[PDB]
């Protein structure tokens, strides 16, 4: 993410364990992310019997940071860890369907409303 190599958490109902940043998207001539950034992930780990398996090269976007995500009111949303939601790289959007923890409301679109099942926050 902010550094090359760097393992961070799966944030889908597709995968398990950890996955590894190879590059950032949404620009070049950098080797660091910001906040509300677009990642390039390779899967390091995850179960082969789920939709996510070792060494699929995919696109992904940030859903948590332990630095925390912000833009409109500048007021952060911080979490227990750095985490990133996988895209399909061919059809995009969240490849998984639930998770128990929430999304950042400061960087908020279709890609964060398709990845949870809490009724009192927008679906």
């Amino acid at each position: 993410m902010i550094q090359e190599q760097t393992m961070l958490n799966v944030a889908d109902n597709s995968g398990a364990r950890r996955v590894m940043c190879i590059k950032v998207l949404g620009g070049s001539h950098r080797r660091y992310a910001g906040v509300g950034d677009i990642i390039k992930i390779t899967i390091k780990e995850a179960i082969p019997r789920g939709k996510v398996k070792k060494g699929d090269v995919l696109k992904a976007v940030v859903v948590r940071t332990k630095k925390g995500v912000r833009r409109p009111d500048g007021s952060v949303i911080r979490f227990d860890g750095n985490a990133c939601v996988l895209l399909n790289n061919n059809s995009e959007q969240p490849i998984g369907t639930r998770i128990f923890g929430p999304v950042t409301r400061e960087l908020r679109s279709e890609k964060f409303m398709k990845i949870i099942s809490l009724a009192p926050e927008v679906l």
Binding site: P72, D73, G74, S75
Partner: protein, 209 residues
Amino acid sequence: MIGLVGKKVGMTRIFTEDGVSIPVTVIEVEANRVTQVKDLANDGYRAIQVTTGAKKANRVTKPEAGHFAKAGVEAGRGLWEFRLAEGEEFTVGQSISVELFADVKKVDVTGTSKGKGFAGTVKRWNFRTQDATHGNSLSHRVPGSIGQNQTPGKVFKGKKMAGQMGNERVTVQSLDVVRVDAERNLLLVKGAVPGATGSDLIVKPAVKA
């Protein structure tokens, strides 16, 4: 019309009716007493001379004092003068304050001595902190090299490296005023603006088109 000398005094994250809050610097705009004014027989260009803000006139010199005496007297800290930008003033005072940035919502701002001392290395120049482990010794922050060989025969002009730096300017240019707010005489400019906190500045409006 003119460059209006404010003070850096306050900075605020302000709310808007978009759902966004905008980080800002808040500048006290004062009233304007115009002074002697130079016409276009004088130095060749039509400009307006202004005193915005003042001091206790215990330190004043008579040669500045005659300017204020023949026009609106205000026992000024100094003289600032301006080539036109939107227009001009009444030649003794037009009591201008927040009004100046209501016909333009864009500022250019003038280059001021930036109040960061040296700033310089690792702050506006392309140096880093170089490796410190694997027996790297006496070389931790200095570039190590800057030129090449007898080929150029010397150091290039495009390369630059200085232990220290004196008064340095360069503006942000062309940046939007977010608001001006009447009855408190407040000029809100977005985020960055040349100067430390508690600095003076000159604020000119738009010069570019």
